[PDB]
């Protein structure tokens, strides 16, 4: 149903996980690829139900330096205090691009998946992908590449690894599909805005009408695409 290659399930991210991602969305790192945390889930029926995740604060003034593991060791302590243990079944970012697989982060994804084969790695997409389809990409890396390990190497283990021909994209799992009853009270926050304090629901509808009027929703993306196409193709 949701299995990949012999150890991995799909991911199931309920919305209470998602809101803590969009507290540190594309801010505290705007043009800076914040690795926005590690996906702390749990292995349940067909699905890696993420329960809570913590945003990893890289040293973000204009760049990203790897901060304390003592943060991660205390967030796993903070989460074990009240919730599930640190069952990191992925890691997630957004983070300033539409649908890109970062090669050094793919190597951070590769050794993550060599360590824990039950892993998909999430690439969140806010309205910076111009909306835009597939706003949630839990791309895992090829288990045939996880077979020939390590890693992808340049002149040796590249003819050998591509005569096996491991795939290059593989298993972007379907993520959120179901009312998992973590839903409960944000459903109950929907009925109130629905109800007579409905000033906050139309403001999100107001965020539609101005997203389409004046933004280069196609052109500024394509100009970033035509930048990315004329460079990365010719170098290959």
């Amino acid at each position: 149903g949701g299995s990949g290659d012999s150890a991995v399930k799909q991911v199931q991210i309920d919305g209470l996980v998602v809101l803590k991602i969009i507290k540190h969305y594309q801010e505290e790192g705007q043009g800076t690829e914040v690795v926005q945390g590690v996906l702390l889930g749990l292995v349940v029926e067909d699905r890696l139900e993420i329960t809570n995740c913590f945003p990893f604060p890289q040293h973000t003034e204009d760049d990203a330096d790897f901060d304390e593991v003592q943060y991660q060791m205390e967030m796993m302590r903070s989460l074990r205090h009240v919730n599930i243990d640190h069952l990191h079944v992925g890691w997630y970012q957004s983070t300033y691009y539409g649908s890109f697989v970062t090669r050094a982060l793919l190597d951070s994804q590769f050794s993550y998946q060599h360590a824990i084969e039950e892993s998909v790695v999430l690439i969140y997409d806010p309205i910076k992908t111009a909306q835009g389809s597939l706003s949630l990409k839990a791309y895992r890396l090829t288990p045939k590449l996880m077979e020939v390990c390590k890693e992808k190497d340049f002149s040796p283990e590249a003819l050998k690894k591509a005569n096996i021909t491991f795939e290059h994209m593989f298993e972007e799992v379907p993520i959120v599909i179901k009312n998992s009853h973590l839903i409960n009270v944000l459903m109950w926050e929907l009925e109130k805005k629905s109800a007579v304090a409905d000033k906050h629901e139309l403001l999100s509808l107001a965020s539609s009408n101005h997203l389409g009027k004046n933004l280069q929703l196609l052109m500024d993306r394509v100009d970033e695409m035509s930048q990315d196409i004329v460079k990365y193709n010719t170098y290959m």
């Binding site: 803590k20 540190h24 945003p55 205390e74 926050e189 196409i229």
Partner: protein
Amino acid sequence: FPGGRVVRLHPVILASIVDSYERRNEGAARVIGTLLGTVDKHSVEVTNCFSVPHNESEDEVAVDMEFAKNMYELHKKVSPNELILGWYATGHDITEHSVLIHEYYSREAPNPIHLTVDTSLQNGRMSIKAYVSTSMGVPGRTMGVMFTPLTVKYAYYDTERIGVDLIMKTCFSPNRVIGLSSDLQQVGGASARIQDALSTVLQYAEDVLSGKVSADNTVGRFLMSLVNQVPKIVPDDFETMLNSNINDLLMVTYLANLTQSQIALNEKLVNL
């Protein structure tokens, strides 16, 4: 004017409540935590929180404020925007045990901004009830309080509210992320439908006896607020620009389909 009047929130607060209430730390009804945020001169901007392991009982109140410092140690490390504004707990309102949760927060003592998460089965019972404590004199026992009511509002990052509305539709029924602009078209046709369903009855309202009162020169303006946006008035050079802009962006779509192939034509030849 006395400061505490309004608290502005997000459902990420109600996420951090309920995710710590629906993994629960065995806290069946009472899931208690520490709200964090900022204030602005009459208003309160709470933007994220986390549940300290608490135990509010008779007459035990556990507040691991050192962990509420340690969670504040982690959160100030993540996000330098928020300050400990109080303690949140679930339902219900004013208790003599909150007077203890006053005191653990009065160990810190910034302004008392409370968040009672009324765990109710209702609609008019507000899912998050906020309070500032008045009188608030008290050199005598712990903290004698009356709670001045604070109103809860949502005003912070807006694509999180685009996000939580998708989450509230995920709360309704997922609504996975596949079609979004194509799905927006059906949502754009849905808001179109009730507009026609209302305002043609608003035609019928004045056409039966005496309706279209608040719709004579409001809904006549409400439709004018739309037709100023689409369609432009009815210019045909606009449509000639549009059919050009059809043939512009379709040619962009055409060469996107050409670069769809020629990317692969370098890719697939080198994989013979």
